[PDB]
Amino acid sequence: IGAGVPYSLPAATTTTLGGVKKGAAVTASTATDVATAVKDLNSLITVLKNAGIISL
Amino acid sequence: LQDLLFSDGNVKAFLQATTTDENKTALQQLLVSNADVLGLLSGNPTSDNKINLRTMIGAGVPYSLPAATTTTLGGVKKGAAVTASTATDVATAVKDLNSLITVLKNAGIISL
Amino acid sequence: LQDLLFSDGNVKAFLQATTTDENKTALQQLLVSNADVLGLLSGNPTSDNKINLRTM
């Protein structure tokens, strides 16, 4: 009958297409020095790591 | 005696407990009125029968997860690991931002 | 002669090769015991039949 099995959405891996969770909110950067700019970049990285969008 | 008692040849084959595929098609038609179910009983439903049989039982087709596009929801691959930034100058901070961008590009999370 | 030989009216309609939808429902019941499959053979399975047919 051309039917499929019950589909379960797998988590993304480095080799295989999958779902992700949406990352937490991240504030736009108003940094005027390097230290703060780096702080803001790192906040984005952690958010993407927390949501399993990028690897640890 | 069955020949003297019954006119229908498909019924007669059933009563002899020996039916051909043609007899079976005719006997199915005496037993079931829904055309899509008759398609199923044949073992060879048409394309239309298949669609209608799935509708009949509320079944879906085999699902294949498509890649995300700019217009359509889809799956992604998970991005490679990215190190937290310890940059103390602009050059390094920019280096770290770009590393994140490439990782997201590599995983098809953002467009080239 | 079929009237003299058989009591069941749904069987008699089958033997005459002329069945109504009601005769077909009864004949299906003589042939198949699973309630969800009987739902399928009707062409109009209930919500419960549909769930059970997919499981099946």
Residue numbers in the entry:
A (entry chain 1u): 226 to 281
B (entry chain 1h): 170 to 281
C (entry chain 2t): 170 to 225
Original paper wording:
We calculated the cryo-electron microscopy (cryoEM) reconstructions of the ϕ29 prohead, the mature head and the genome emptied head to a resolution of 3.6, 3.2, and 3.2 Å, respectively. The complete mature and the genome-emptied virion models each consist of 235 copies of the major capsid protein gp8, 165 copies of the minor capsid protein gp8.5, 12 copies each of the connector protein gp10 and the tail protein gp11, 36 copies of the tail appendage protein gp12* and 6 copies of the tail knob protein gp9. Structural comparisons of the heads showed overall small differences between the heads (an average r.m.s.d of 0.7 Å). Structural comparisons of the mature and the genome-emptied heads showed that the equatorial part of the genome-emptied head expanded slightly after the ejection of the genome. However, the icosahedral end caps shrink upon the release of the inner pressure, showing the elasticity of the capsid. The ϕ29 capsid undergoes only miniscule conformational changes upon genome loading and release and does not generate sufficiently large holes for the exit of the scaffolding protein.
